[PDB]
Structure formats: C-alpha cells, structure tokens
Amino acid sequence: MHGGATTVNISTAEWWPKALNLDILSQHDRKTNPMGPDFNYQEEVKKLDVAALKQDLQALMTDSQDWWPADWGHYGGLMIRLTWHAAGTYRIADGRGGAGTGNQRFAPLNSWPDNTNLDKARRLLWPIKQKYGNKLSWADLIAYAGTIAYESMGLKTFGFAFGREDIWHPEKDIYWGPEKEWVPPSTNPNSRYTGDRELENPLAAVTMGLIYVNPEGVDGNPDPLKTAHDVRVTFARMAMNDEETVALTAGGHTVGKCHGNGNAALLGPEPEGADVEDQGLGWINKTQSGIGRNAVTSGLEGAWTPHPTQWDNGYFRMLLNYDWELKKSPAGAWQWEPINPREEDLPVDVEDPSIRRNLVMTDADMAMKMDPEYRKISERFYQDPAYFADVFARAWFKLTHRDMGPKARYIGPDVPQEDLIWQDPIPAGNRNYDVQAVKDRIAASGLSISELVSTAWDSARTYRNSDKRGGANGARIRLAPQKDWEGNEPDRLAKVLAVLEGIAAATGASVADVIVLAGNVGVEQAARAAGVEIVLPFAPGRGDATAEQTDTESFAVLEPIHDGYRNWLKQDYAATPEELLLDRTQLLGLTAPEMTVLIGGLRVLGTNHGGTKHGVFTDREGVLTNDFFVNLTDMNYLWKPAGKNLYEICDRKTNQVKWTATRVDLVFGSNSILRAYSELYAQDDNKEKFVRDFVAAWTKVMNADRFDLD
Amino acid sequence: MHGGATTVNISTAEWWPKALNLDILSQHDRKTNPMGPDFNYQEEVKKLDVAALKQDLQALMTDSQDWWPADWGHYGGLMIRLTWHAAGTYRIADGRGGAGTGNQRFAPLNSWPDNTNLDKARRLLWPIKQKYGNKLSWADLIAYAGTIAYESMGLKTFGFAFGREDIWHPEKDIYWGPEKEWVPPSTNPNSRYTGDRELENPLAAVTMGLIYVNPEGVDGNPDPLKTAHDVRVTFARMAMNDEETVALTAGGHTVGKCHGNGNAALLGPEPEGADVEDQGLGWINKTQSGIGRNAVTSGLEGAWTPHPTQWDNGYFRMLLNYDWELKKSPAGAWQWEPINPREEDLPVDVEDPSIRRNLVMTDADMAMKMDPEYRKISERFYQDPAYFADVFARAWFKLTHRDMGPKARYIGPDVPQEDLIWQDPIPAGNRNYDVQAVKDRIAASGLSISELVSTAWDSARTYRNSDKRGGANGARIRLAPQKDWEGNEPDRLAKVLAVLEGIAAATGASVADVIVLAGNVGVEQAARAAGVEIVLPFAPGRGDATAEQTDTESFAVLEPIHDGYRNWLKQDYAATPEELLLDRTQLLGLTAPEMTVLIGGLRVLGTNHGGTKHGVFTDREGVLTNDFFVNLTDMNYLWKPAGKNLYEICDRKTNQVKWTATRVDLVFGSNSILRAYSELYAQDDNKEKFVRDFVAAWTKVMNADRFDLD
Ligand code: HEM
Ligand code: HEM
Ligand SMILES: NNC(=O)c1ccncc1
Ligand SMILES: NNC(=O)c1ccncc1
Ligand SMILES: NNC(=O)c1ccncc1
Ligand SMILES: NNC(=O)c1ccncc1
Ligand SMILES: NNC(=O)c1ccncc1
Ligand SMILES: NNC(=O)c1ccncc1
Ligand code: NA
Ligand code: NA
Ligand code: NA
Ligand code: NA
Ligand code: NA
Ligand code: NA
Ligand code: NA
Ligand code: NA
C-alpha cells in the first residue's frame, strides 16, 4: 500500500471541522493555471474572429451528433438551458455564482441534478472551443451559446460581451447550502429553511442542487400559488423582479422541451460519480436507449409550445387559452397538461415529425397564470408581444452579464452602447492633473491619518470579485445609500468628504481619485512618522458616478455589516467574526499573507470603527510599524476572554490589563497558519518587509476595481 | 447569514469522496508563501551567525520561563523530545514525515496526543527565531534544539546541518492512517492492522497520533515482549536497526522525565481545537496548576535516571540493576517502577530539589531488557559506554537528517565530512567535456527514441521530494538492485547501458550525464520528426555512484512497482492506477498540468513498459505531437471497459476497436480538471505550447535531484 493522501476524504478537515478554510484565499494560483504567466485572455479575445464564431455556433444548432441527437434537428433549446443554468447560479447577497467563470464544467455544478444532460451540451460545444482555442474561453462560449440559439430561432437578442476568463478548478469559496443530499424536502434535518419557510440568506435556491425552484411544486407537491412564492423569492435573490421573472420564464419555454420518456432510475451516475469510461459525461443510460425520444432529463415530458424550435407567441397562447390539469409523465413526474388540446397544437416527436406528442406546463409555468401579479404581466405579454420580446431580450442579457462587472470589462462587437443601471456605470475621470498638488492640499488640510485612511478603506472595501461590483471607482461612498451606512461612520465621513470635495473642485481630479489619494497620503505620513520615506503607487482616472446611475436598492447587498479590518460588527451574528473576515477577504481577492499585514497595519494606524482601541497594540498609534505582531506574539501576556468578541491582554507578572482585543485580532495569534505569518512579521529583521507588504496590499485593494486601466 | 465556504467541512469532498485529490499537486504555491519571489533560504542561512545562535540556544536551556517552567531549571529533556518527535514521523516507504519541513508547527502534527505540550517547547524557541529571523527557519531551529540540548547536557554530538526551508501550511500529501479517532486499539473498525497483526504498509506507527509505539503496551496492555515486536517494526520503518533502536531509546531517556502528576481529563483541547485565547497553545489546564510538578503530558510520571539533567550511564544502570514491577502513575497510566530503590537514586522534584520523587521505565524501556536481542545490545552499551555514546550520537544525527537528501543540501560549520551511506553519496561529475560531441555519438548509435527516452525516464523517476532520495544523479540505475528491477526492463536497460557506458568512457562525461543527455536526444529527435527544432536545456556534472556507496536494501523502497507514466503496474493493487500516478507525481514535485503533458508526450513517444500500445493514440509513434489529447477528446469514439485496467476505444459508427487504453490514460479524459487540461492541449492553436510544456516538464524531472548545482 502507498502513503499518498490520494482521495479527497483523507484530511485535517475531519479532525477540526470548525477551522478557518484558509484555502479559499489561495485558489486559482500558478500551479493550477496551465497558461503561461504572460497570457492575457482579454487581449486575446480582442483578436477573436467573432463573425466566423457566430457562423459556426449557428451551424452547430442544426448539426445533430448521433451520440446525443438534436431534438427535431435543433440543439437550440438544449443550448439555452445550458446558458440559463450557467447564469442561473448567481445570487446577489455575495455575488457568487453566475456564468462569469465557466464553473459549470467543474464540480459540483457539473453534477447537480438540475444540470442533468448539460454535460452533453458542453461536450457538443467542444469542436468550436477546439477551433478558436485560447481566444475563446469556455466561460464565454457557454455564456454565448444560448444567445446564438435565440438568434437562430428568431429572437432579436439585445447583445453580448466577451471577456470571461476561464478557471481550472471548482470555486471553493462558494457555500451552496447546508444539505448533504440532493434535492431533499424542506423538512429534513439540515434544512435551508428557518422560521416561517424563510430561506436562509445567502442562498437563492429552494434546495441543494436546483437552480431556483422545484418544477413539480414545493417539496415536490404541485401548488402553483406556493410555487409562485418560491419563484418570486429565488428570482429576487438573483436580481430579477416580477416582470423580468415572467419574461424569462415564458421566453425560456417558448422553445425546447421536457425530457422524461423512460425510467429515471436507469440513468447512470452524475459526472463526478461516473467511472472513466463515460468520458467525463454522466447520467448515461446503459440499460436502454437513453437518447432522442428516449431521453430522460428532468423526468417531465412534453413541450410548452406547438413549435418548440422557434420563437413565437406559443407560450401564452397555450397557457392562457387552454385549461390545465395534473398528470404524471412516463418517468413519474407531476406535470400539467391541457384539457382537450387540438391535434394541430401538439408538438411532434423529436425524431419523427409524423408523430404527435404532448404539451406540458410545469408548476412554475402554472404559477405565471395563477399568481395574481404574474397573471397581469402574462396577459400584458400575450396582448403586447413586442413588449414581451424586448423585456425578455433585455432580461436574458442581464441574466448572462450580471456578474461581468463594469462595462470597461466587456469586449466585442455586440456590446450594447446603452449603460444599464445594473452595470453600476461610472464615467472616465480626468487624468490630467498634478497629483502632488492634490497631495499637498490633502496634507495641508487638518484631516488626521485615521480619517484619511479609514475613508479610503471604506470607499474601496465594498469591492467583491464574485461579480465585480463595488470598489473606490465612482465615489459612490458620497451618495445614497452608502453615505449613511453605519459602518461608514457618516459624521466622520461627511467631515472628510466636505474637505475632499473642495480639493477635487479646485484641482479637476474626481472626488474618487481624491479619496484614494488621500488614503495614500495618510499611509505616507504614517510611514514617515516611523522614519520611512515612500511614495505609494497611484493611478488617476476614477470617475464620480451619479445618483441617477446608482440603483439604491441594489447596493444594499454591499453594505458593510461586518469588517474585521476596522474591527467592525453591526450586530452579534452566528458566524464567528473571523469567518466573516475570511469571507470579506476572499471577495476582495486578498491572500492570507495580505490579509494578515493589512490587519496589523490598519490596527496601528488607529482606524477601528468608533475609535475603539481593540487590537491597537502600540504606544505609537499613527505610526506604521509592525508593533501589532510584536506584541501579539509576546508571551509576557496572557489573553483572558472578557465577554462577546472581547479579550483582555494581561501582563502575566503584574496581572494588569495592558490592551484589549477582539477575536479578529487574536485569531492571527491563534490559528497556526496565521500565527506563522504573524511571527514572520514580528521578526527583528522584517520591519521593512512589513511596510513594503502593507503597502503592496493597500495598493491592491485601492486598485481592485480598475478595469478601466488598459 | 454570509455565502463563504468559511470552515473546512463545507466541500465537494463530501459528495464524491473517491475523487482524486489533485490539490496535493498545487501545495506550497505563491499565494501561501509569504516570502518574496527572489528569497532563497539556502543563501540566507549561509550568512547566519551560527556561533551566536549556539550560544543563545544553550542559554535558553537554563532560562526558565514562568508560564512553562523548566524541569530542574533545564529545558533539555523537553527540547530533545521536541526534536525527536519532529524527526520521528519519518517513514521509509514514501519518505514522508521527518523534521525536514518544520511540519510540527502546523496541523495535524501540532495536535497529536504524542505531541502534547511540545506546543510550549516550540513557543519557548520563538525569541530565538525572532532574533535570527529569515536566516533561521523554524524547521532548522526545531531540528537543532535537541542537538544543542545534548551538547549542553554533556554529550558529544556528531554534527548538524542547516538547510531546511520552512513551509506555510500542512502537508496535504501525507496519509497518516485510516482511523478517525486518536489512539484507538488495534481492534477498532478502520484498523491499520491486517492479517496477523501486520501493520499496513506505508504506516510506521502502531496507531493514529503516536510517533512509534504505545508506551503503556500494545493497545494499552503492558507486555514488554509484545512492545518489543512493535518497537522493532516501527523503528525499522523509520530506517533504524536493533542497535540504533536500543541506542536511541536509551540515549533519549538518559535525560528528562515523564509527566503525569494530575488528572489528564482536566487538560483543555489540543491546539487545533483550542479557542483564540490559548495563543495557539493547547492542553492548557485551567482547573488546577498544570505546570512544573503538576504538569501532565503522557500521563506517566517519573524519570528514568537519577540525574535527568545530564548525560551519564544512569539508564542501563537503573534498568539492568533494579528489578521492576507495574504500577499506575497518578494520572492512571501503567508504568514500571523499581523494586526497592535506594534513596540516592531517586530523581528529585522538578521545583524543589530537597524532595525525592520516583524512577520509571515505560513498556518500551522494559522491552530493551526483556527482548533477547535488545538485551544483548543493552548489556554491550552498559559495559561499553563509549561505544554507546558513539552509536547514539550517530543515530541521533541520522534521525534528524535522514530526510535532508544529498550532502550537497547540507549547510553550516558542523556538517560531518564523513559520507554516511544513508546520504546516498555521489561524487561530482566532470563538467569539462563537449556536450554536442556526446549527443552526436548518441545519435549515431542505433538506439531508438523509445530506448533513449525510457532509459532516461527510468533513471530520474525514482526521485522523491519527501526525503530527496533518488533521481538521475549517480546513475544508480546501472547498479544493484535497480538494474534488475522488473519495471526497469533489465534486458533493454543492459542493452542501452552497454552503449552509453562506451560513450561515457570515450568522452569523460559520467554515465549519469550521458543517460540524461541521451533522453534529451531522443526527445529532440522526436520533435525534429514533427518539424520542430529545439535543443533541450542541459546541465552537466552528475556523478556516478559506486556499489560501495549504495545501500542495496535501503533502495528497495524506491523500486517502481507502479509508474503511470510508462503505463506500468507490477501487480494488481487495491489502490486505483490513477491514485498511484497521483502519488508518484506528488513525490516527483510535478503539478497537475505537468503530469498531464508528460503523459501525453510519453505516450506518443512509444515508451510504455513492455512495448504495449495502451494509450498510444497516434499513427506516428516516435513523433512528439499532441495526438494523445486530440484523440482522447474526440467524441467519434466510445470507451468500453475490457477487463482489468483496460478499455477499448471504439469507433461509434463502425464499432471497431481503434486503440486500447488503461485507466491511467483515460482518467485525463474523465476527471473534470484533467480533461480541462487535456482539452487545452488538444486545441488547434496549442501544438507548440504542448511541445514547449512537455519539454519544460521533462527538464524539471531530469534536474529534480541537482542540489549540487549552486
Ligand atoms: C422559473 C423556473 C423554471 C423552471 C421550474 C424550469 C423548469 C424546466 C424544466 C423542468 C425543464 C425540462 C428539462 C428537461 O427535462 O430536459 C426546462 C427546460 C428548459 N427551460 Fe426551464 N425552467 C424555469 C426557468 C427557465 C428560464 C428562466 C429559462 C430561460 C430563460 C428556461 C429555459 C428552459 C429551456 C430552453 C428548456 C429546454 C431544454 C431543452 O429543450 O433541452 N427555463 N425548464
Ligand atoms: C521507543 C519508544 C519510545 C517511547 C515509547 C517513548 C516514550 C516516552 C514517554 C512516554 C515520555 C514522557 C513524555 C512526558 O510525559 O512528558 C518520553 C519522554 C522522552 N523521551 Fe521517549 N520514548 C521513546 C523513544 C524515544 C527516543 C528515540 C528519544 C530520543 C532519542 C526519546 C526521548 C525522550 C525524551 C528526552 C523525553 C523527555 C521529555 C521531558 O523531559 O520533557 N524517546 N518518552
Ligand atoms: N416510445 N415513446 C412513446 O411512446 C412516448 C413519447 C412521449 N410521450 C409519451 C410516450
Ligand atoms: N443516456 N445516454 C447518454 O447520455 C449517452 C449516449 C451516447 N454517448 C454518450 C452519452
Ligand atoms: N427531485 N428532482 C430532481 O431530482 C431533478 C430535478 C430537475 N432535473 C433533474 C432531476
Ligand atoms: N503534589 N505532587 C506529588 O505529591 C507527587 C509528585 C510526583 N509523583 C507523585 C506525587
Ligand atoms: N497547563 N498549562 C499550560 O499549558 C500553560 C500555562 C501557562 N501559560 C500557557 C500555557
Ligand atoms: N492513549 N495514550 C495517549 O493518549 C497519549 C500518549 C502519549 N502522550 C499523551 C497521550
Ligand atoms: Na502554471
Ligand atoms: Na459570481
Ligand atoms: Na415556440
Ligand atoms: Na527582512
Ligand atoms: Na507570496
Ligand atoms: Na519527508
Ligand atoms: Na541522566
Ligand atoms: Na498556442
């Protein structure tokens, strides 16, 4: 027998399941990235022959492959379902999920029950990926496929942007929910539901391994009105309102079908569970024909429209004009079928068009008819189909781009020139100003180091790499709702902004550029106070966004209700402060060593929310030294718990309290990885490395949102 | 609630526990390494003030700290136990474990029950680490501490080498055993024992969380003769024979004591389980005094010698001259105490020397008296103490250096000039020869590409980064036992060596240098055959080792009984072929993208063991192309299992068998990470990237053991 920890279960994880998952900070690194260190996907994708790609992708739609034949000779429905599921994992609370990384090709998502047979759809796109190569990411390809499908089936799509860079392993940072089985009912142990069927907060799906809701009803029990409530809830958590939700649902089901003509128990394991002979595919039926008319996917069986290969007004025509009742598909799934349909409305067999099959609606489709608010939108869409096609095209674009970040990241010839509000638009800022002059005015203000640093931190800290929202570009901190957020210390913030707005007015640098420049100046002073002279790198050009281009409600999810870096917690939460710091740090894109130096430096700069002294382990606040680490690692002190999220650092000999500290401070001296970092920075020889690393991490955070730069 | 996978249990690991643990290949990367990319510990440690360090470390031995006072005012015993436990995790079967990485400061090892209170010992060394900084790794410091302790307590140690570079997280590649509890009896479910109490093979300890054996007896039942069997077995798996084993045991227990004066149930959680207030420490007693005379560590209580602060002949004097019986320590542990000791032989209280305490022996100590083979060595050591001190000093040096690799890695002023056989010595090879001339002779031989490449691969593939043994330096492939290993294809190997020995003789390049140069030539030709002209980088200087300096039995553990890279398996094993490939790849130091290109390239070069065609998915064998990937990713084929570790690749349309393949081949098309890599290399635009990456990986492997270079 061999001594390799060679399968995934063998681990430290079993022994101390509560430990911080620091691995989420060291993802997507060089040893996993198979590309050269100078590869730049954005510059490559700019060279892609898009017109040629569009042509090949359109041709693929009607180029049936015999190992997974196209329904009616057209892969369009499959491809739209692929792209909808790719995008459909997004959620607004943390920005995680979405189509922006091509994550559907990796675990767990490649093997979710809701993604059954999308393994074949991905595989069908391989010859195109093979052809266009490094200039076409799987992520962009997967995001594009359904858009091209809509074009080929007769819908005028609103546009498309390239620019999604591929990843090479699962996104380990994404918590998909608490369950340890696929699609368990909402009364299971480990439920994602609390209280009065309230869906726990980051989550945007009703159960583990579904995209949004259960097509058969809540917990598998048909009831259109309860299904509607779940639809409304899950879709809102994916940034969509009633109109967008009805449009998306109807528009999706205007094409394609449900596959459930066989026995679902005969499908082989999902892809991560299948053995090598299945070619990275899953759900393979080796007992009977599992393809064409015998395909089984969701278990429901039928098409929503008479002509599932084309964009039309079939969906509301069927739904609204027929009356419907519950039936069981051949695989045993609940579905709705129409009472007394006409022959001529029956969709035909996917292999032989001389045979007629059946129409179907899911519980979510029936919701669009029975929920009184959806019913109104549905009737509008049936009576005004041009409006329907417009709203649908726009919502489909939003769906597939909502995690792409600012328009500065978008590439390609079909990028819409409109600025949509959900792109959080920001104009280009003037770059032709004297930086030094601005710095001199900042220094000559009487704003302290702590005011300066806290304000620039608070402006940048909202950035999240999950969907590329937030950050210092735009100076949205000066606008509603940010300017009144409790974590942002609105009085201190109003005080600093009054000054810095004056400076911006006077110099023609944006308020955004000045906020950042000012934090640089506070850091610079703090270093100078330690006898270190440095100038921090600085890139001008940030714009100031307007209130008109700032969706107030959509910014709610970026509010800092916790920020370990300023020892801030708005309330007492169930998660530990240090887990919350890890989460925020992962969204900022920071590594564990970065996280560590930032904490130590921010602490000694005197930047804690409320001017608290927790973790301020220095006799010289305002001076950028490694004191935090020196003192944290000093065994002349013992640490005594002193209530909620608080500790006394006491002298072992005198039994006097020297400092206080929170769990955010003390984890850097407790966790064995973080203390190893703390010890490195507390070494006699690493005072200058500490400053230099602090600076580099500061700068990283100030520039996180600068996609406008090249 | 927040959407971060923020604690270690949240994972893909739960869902598909059988999946390959590819993370073990992407360890110790840039995002975890807090040092600058140009930091080089070897060049820094060369600048360390060793004499000053020796002085500080010696002073620490008698610089008692009040939070964990030194027994009798001397930390020596604690520090030797620290260093022995650090080194004592080594095992020969895979080279994993040992003191060579400073792993004791990270999970799981920092919290093993056998490492109780070594958290305090590590902490006590922090002020020295803080002082010497980046020029002194925690790894070297921990390895050195016990050596300096022995010096200060009167023993002439044999020497010491610096050069162990620190790591920054647990070694995820090390499988420590199957149990999910600490120290369970050998009849538990999940036992590491098979058959007739046969210890499963990589493992070198009798249970989970112990270093070697149970000090209270087998499964906690005292019986010196059964304890002896476990001692003999575990120590042999750590490279030590009877003489070294008795010397180590006696020499360790010549100093220090067992701590068990209290109740073990009152000790707080081990370090990874303790909360933030414990300062990364563990086992803290908050209910009563847990320090000094009230310390509890193993639960046994007493010292082996009258004078535990000094090197002497107390150990065999006590053991051999007193008769012993079983008693229970105050913590409730079984131990041996002497019948009728004299007052004057009783070790005194650790805080107050006017109080006498007790002598003790463990079951392993009694083994040294009762096992008939140990008894003889013990009497030799008692009658010849100079011999004892010599053997012990040498074995202690071996213990602490056995995973350091060749002497070329050793640094510092106390490196022994002797070449010990366990360092696998190799001389410097002549570097002043004409490389091209050698290449021309190789090319003009009639040795094929496959002979050339296979032979260089087989010479290098034995390298393992766990203990830095093996590799192409030394040309030990031409010697016993390697030249007759079945995986090395001894006839083909004898045929190639006859030629290449001739070339080496003729040119004054070592046989080692020529073996590698020859593989480069085979690769070069193969590329030329594809119309690509490259010259592979090459570093001369390898030596040819002698039989006299090659310990035949110790090389047994490097035999290639499996090597996916040449589609080789010596027998049918319980582990899957792909898990075995992952293990080997991790020991070679390769990343997953490296592993991937190496497989594809080796396959098309025609290098499989036995000249098999499994995975040879080309019509042009001998030509270095990306054909393997092109064909592997082609859905014109289906894959049919065809017995053990074998598959047929069949044309979907004709149902004819086109190629055959093993699991090692097909996992690269099945695993979702590996197929993502396979697809990258099968892209129309990546023929040259494939060759270039192949070459870079080839070169990496050929140079893995070249510590002689700078
Ligand atoms: C609102 C909740 C939704 C539910 C419960 C739902 C449910 C389903 C189900 C059960 C299938 C059948 C899958 C199969 O068996 O092959 C399916 C197919 C599909 N859905 Fe949805 N859907 C929803 C929303 C959407 C949206 C928002 C889109 C796109 C805008 C979409 C587009 C599609 C398409 C194109 C197919 C056809 C697949 C094919 O022809 O292969 N659906 N839907
Ligand atoms: C052969 C099996 C061995 C067993 C079962 C064993 C067992 C133990 C036990 C139970 C303790 C007491 C720990 C405590 O309660 O503080 C201990 C202490 C120690 N052992 Fe071993 N030991 C073994 C081999 C070794 C070796 C090979 C070395 C070094 C060459 C060593 C050196 C020490 C030292 C120095 C201490 C004293 C710790 C102190 O004074 O704080 N032992 N041993
Ligand atoms: N063999 N296939 C059928 O008879 C069938 C197809 C679709 N819905 C119901 C039945
Ligand atoms: N259920 N059948 C399939 O998923 C399949 C059929 C043929 N080749 C690959 C996959
Ligand atoms: N319980 N429902 C499912 O397992 C399922 C749902 C949608 N597609 C496939 C399977
Ligand atoms: N309080 N400590 C004792 O009485 C003791 C110390 C060591 N062995 C036995 C007893
Ligand atoms: N059992 N007691 C201890 O481990 C300890 C005592 C004082 N400070 C730190 C640790
Ligand atoms: N069962 N034995 C133990 O748990 C143990 C052994 C050695 N040191 C501490 C604890
Ligand atoms: Na790389
Ligand atoms: Na996202
Ligand atoms: Na239609
Ligand atoms: Na330094
Ligand atoms: Na780094
Ligand atoms: Na090792
Ligand atoms: Na002694
Ligand atoms: Na290329």
PDB file of N, CA, C and O in Angstrom, chain B residues 603-618:
ATOM      1  N   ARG B 603       3.337   8.980 -24.019  1.00  0.00           N
ATOM      2  CA  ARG B 603       2.574   8.033 -24.753  1.00  0.00           C
ATOM      3  C   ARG B 603       2.914   7.993 -26.252  1.00  0.00           C
ATOM      4  O   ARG B 603       2.987   6.894 -26.828  1.00  0.00           O
ATOM      5  N   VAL B 604       3.025   9.157 -26.884  1.00  0.00           N
ATOM      6  CA  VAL B 604       3.183   9.203 -28.366  1.00  0.00           C
ATOM      7  C   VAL B 604       4.632   8.929 -28.716  1.00  0.00           C
ATOM      8  O   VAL B 604       4.929   8.535 -29.849  1.00  0.00           O
ATOM      9  N   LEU B 605       5.523   9.047 -27.737  1.00  0.00           N
ATOM     10  CA  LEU B 605       6.911   8.679 -27.973  1.00  0.00           C
ATOM     11  C   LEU B 605       7.107   7.196 -28.017  1.00  0.00           C
ATOM     12  O   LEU B 605       8.095   6.778 -28.533  1.00  0.00           O
ATOM     13  N   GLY B 606       6.163   6.411 -27.509  1.00  0.00           N
ATOM     14  CA  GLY B 606       6.213   4.949 -27.577  1.00  0.00           C
ATOM     15  C   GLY B 606       7.095   4.394 -26.464  1.00  0.00           C
ATOM     16  O   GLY B 606       7.997   3.609 -26.728  1.00  0.00           O
ATOM     17  N   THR B 607       6.824   4.787 -25.219  1.00  0.00           N
ATOM     18  CA  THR B 607       7.668   4.450 -24.074  1.00  0.00           C
ATOM     19  C   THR B 607       7.003   3.523 -23.026  1.00  0.00           C
ATOM     20  O   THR B 607       7.489   3.392 -21.917  1.00  0.00           O
ATOM     21  N   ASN B 608       5.873   2.929 -23.351  1.00  0.00           N
ATOM     22  CA  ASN B 608       5.151   2.136 -22.374  1.00  0.00           C
ATOM     23  C   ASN B 608       6.003   0.925 -21.977  1.00  0.00           C
ATOM     24  O   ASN B 608       6.566   0.264 -22.829  1.00  0.00           O
ATOM     25  N   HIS B 609       5.942   0.512 -20.732  1.00  0.00           N
ATOM     26  CA  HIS B 609       6.618  -0.718 -20.339  1.00  0.00           C
ATOM     27  C   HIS B 609       6.149  -1.900 -21.187  1.00  0.00           C
ATOM     28  O   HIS B 609       4.958  -2.041 -21.462  1.00  0.00           O
ATOM     29  N   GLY B 610       7.067  -2.735 -21.651  1.00  0.00           N
ATOM     30  CA  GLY B 610       6.659  -3.996 -22.403  1.00  0.00           C
ATOM     31  C   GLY B 610       6.295  -3.661 -23.843  1.00  0.00           C
ATOM     32  O   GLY B 610       5.788  -4.516 -24.549  1.00  0.00           O
ATOM     33  N   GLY B 611       6.543  -2.427 -24.289  1.00  0.00           N
ATOM     34  CA  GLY B 611       6.162  -2.011 -25.655  1.00  0.00           C
ATOM     35  C   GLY B 611       4.668  -2.150 -25.976  1.00  0.00           C
ATOM     36  O   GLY B 611       4.252  -2.250 -27.118  1.00  0.00           O
ATOM     37  N   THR B 612       3.840  -2.115 -24.943  1.00  0.00           N
ATOM     38  CA  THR B 612       2.387  -2.036 -25.064  1.00  0.00           C
ATOM     39  C   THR B 612       1.942  -0.765 -25.860  1.00  0.00           C
ATOM     40  O   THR B 612       2.674   0.261 -25.875  1.00  0.00           O
ATOM     41  N   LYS B 613       0.766  -0.836 -26.497  1.00  0.00           N
ATOM     42  CA  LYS B 613       0.162   0.284 -27.241  1.00  0.00           C
ATOM     43  C   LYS B 613      -1.000   0.995 -26.484  1.00  0.00           C
ATOM     44  O   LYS B 613      -1.712   1.830 -27.040  1.00  0.00           O
ATOM     45  N   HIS B 614      -1.215   0.642 -25.234  1.00  0.00           N
ATOM     46  CA  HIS B 614      -2.288   1.269 -24.466  1.00  0.00           C
ATOM     47  C   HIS B 614      -2.014   2.735 -24.345  1.00  0.00           C
ATOM     48  O   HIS B 614      -0.935   3.129 -23.866  1.00  0.00           O
ATOM     49  N   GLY B 615      -2.971   3.541 -24.816  1.00  0.00           N
ATOM     50  CA  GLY B 615      -2.861   4.999 -24.731  1.00  0.00           C
ATOM     51  C   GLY B 615      -2.051   5.603 -25.850  1.00  0.00           C
ATOM     52  O   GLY B 615      -1.885   6.830 -25.883  1.00  0.00           O
ATOM     53  N   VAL B 616      -1.523   4.745 -26.752  1.00  0.00           N
ATOM     54  CA  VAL B 616      -0.695   5.253 -27.851  1.00  0.00           C
ATOM     55  C   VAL B 616      -1.639   5.667 -29.015  1.00  0.00           C
ATOM     56  O   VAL B 616      -1.775   4.975 -30.020  1.00  0.00           O
ATOM     57  N   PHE B 617      -2.293   6.805 -28.842  1.00  0.00           N
ATOM     58  CA  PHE B 617      -3.391   7.260 -29.733  1.00  0.00           C
ATOM     59  C   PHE B 617      -2.755   8.156 -30.806  1.00  0.00           C
ATOM     60  O   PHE B 617      -2.916   9.389 -30.797  1.00  0.00           O
ATOM     61  N   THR B 618      -1.943   7.531 -31.647  1.00  0.00           N
ATOM     62  CA  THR B 618      -1.257   8.203 -32.770  1.00  0.00           C
ATOM     63  C   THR B 618      -1.043   7.195 -33.903  1.00  0.00           C
ATOM     64  O   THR B 618      -0.773   6.051 -33.615  1.00  0.00           O
TER      65      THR B 618
END
